[model samples]
Structure formats: C-alpha cells, structure tokens
Target: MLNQELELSLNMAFARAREHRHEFMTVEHLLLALLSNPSAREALEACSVDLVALRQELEAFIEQTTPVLPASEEERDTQPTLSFQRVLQRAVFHVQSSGRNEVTGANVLVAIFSEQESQAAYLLRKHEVSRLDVVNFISHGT
Candidate 1:
C-alpha cells in the first residue's frame, strides 16, 4: 500500500500536470512531488538521488523501460495494483529505510513487484533476516 505522502505526491503530480495543461502525470511529476516530500526526499538524498539526478534517471528509465511487469496471468487477472510505479515506490521505501547500498534499479523493481516468497524472504523474519538483509531489501532488494 502507498504511504500517505507518496499517495499525496501522486495526486499532486497529477494535479500539477493538469494545471500545466499536460494531459497526464509523467514520472517527472511524481518525482517532483517526491522531492518536495520531506521523508521521501531525505531518503532519496541519502542514496544520492536528489532532485535533478533523480528526475533525469527515473524519466530516462520510464521512457526506455515500458511498464510491463513481473505479474503472471493469474496476477494480472487477480492482483489489483499492476502499475509498476507504485510497486517501485514501496520497494524503494523498503530499501531506503533499510539503507542505501549497491542497490541497482532491478533490485528496486524486484523488491516491490516480486511474489509472496520474495516478499517473505525480504520482509518477514525480523530476527532471522539480518539487519543487513533488511537494509538491503529496503534500499535496493538486491
């Protein structure tokens, strides 16, 4: 589920896009609101993904990598949140709160969108999973 700030950021992005007379919210709009958000912004900065670089990197990735996801036919037919962007946010937040390591983009994607096993592997077992593993999942899922 989206945290309140991320939810607001999405709404704000959509609103800003509409205000600018753009027909839709691009990744740009989303990142802008994210940068403006205190917690998200701080966490992002900790990963050296502050405003300019974050926007550029995310926009480029968004343009090149189509939003097709890791879902199966069963997931597509059943799971509600298919939009990868939202999943990415949850994944990144997990990584960010956990820590900024050598987490690549793929890790972030997997962190958010992977199956229950992966989620359980990364998210469950507060004691069994090392602090490093938790940190890894939170920052990069790598």
Candidate 2:
C-alpha cells in the first residue's frame, strides 16, 4: 500500500497529466511529482540534485514529447503508461518483500531507475543521482 505522502504524490502526478491533457501518465510525470514528496525530495537533495533545474528539464521534456489528448475530449482520462505502472508495481513488490508496511515516495523514486529508457531516469543519471546514492541515503540517512 502507498503511504500518505506517496499517495499524494501519485495523485499529483495523475492530476498533472490530466491538467496538461497528456494521454498517458508517464514516468516523467511521476518524477515531477516526486520533487515535492518529502522522502523523495530528501533523497534527491542528499544526492546534491538541483530540484529546480531538474523540474525545468522535466517540464520541457514532457512538453516536447508526451502526446496530448484532443482538447475537445473533455471527458478523457489520462492513462498510465506500462512503464509507469511497472514502476509502481516494482516499488510495491520491493516494499512487500522487505516487510515494509507502506510504500513511500522514496521507494517509488528508486523504482523509477529501473525504467532506464525513460527520460526521468536519464535526467536523474545526468544529475549524478545514482540508484546507489538514493538507496544509501534511504537506508542509512547518510
């Protein structure tokens, strides 16, 4: 189950997709929402990631790449991309296997790295925020 913070971030991600008329809620949207999630933000900050710069890049990339639903389709609902669903599933499975009660944004952030082809993952790598760095921070608060 998603913890409160992660749930909020998930909702925000979907809302962002809907607001922008994005046909699919991709990993980038999730990463964008994670910027404000406490656990996720802390891990990124610990890795010395510049949140503002990351946000700008993500926004630009998302704007440039994601397909938009027709504005006339007022009843349209944004769908989650397979990769996005996989990230959430991976996060949930990892937390369950580790005996964690709730999956947090930090876990989701770690799961995002598995989507190597995703621009979200690329941006994180570009910023030098390695999976090990996030894991180390989340595990040891170092």
Q: Which one is best on lDDT?
A: 2
Model 1 regions more than 4 Å off = 50-142
Candidate 1 lDDT by residue in tens digits, 1-142:
4456656665666665444444334433444455666554554444444357545655564345424333332333212233435546666666576565333333332343243433222322221433344344444633
Error of 1 at 44 (Å): 1.7
Q: What TM-score number comes out for model 2?
A: 0.95
Candidate 1 structure lDDT: 0.44
**How high is each candidate's TM-score?**
0.40, 0.95
Predicted structure with the largest TM-score when compared to the true one: 2
Full-model lDDT for every candidate: 0.44, 0.91
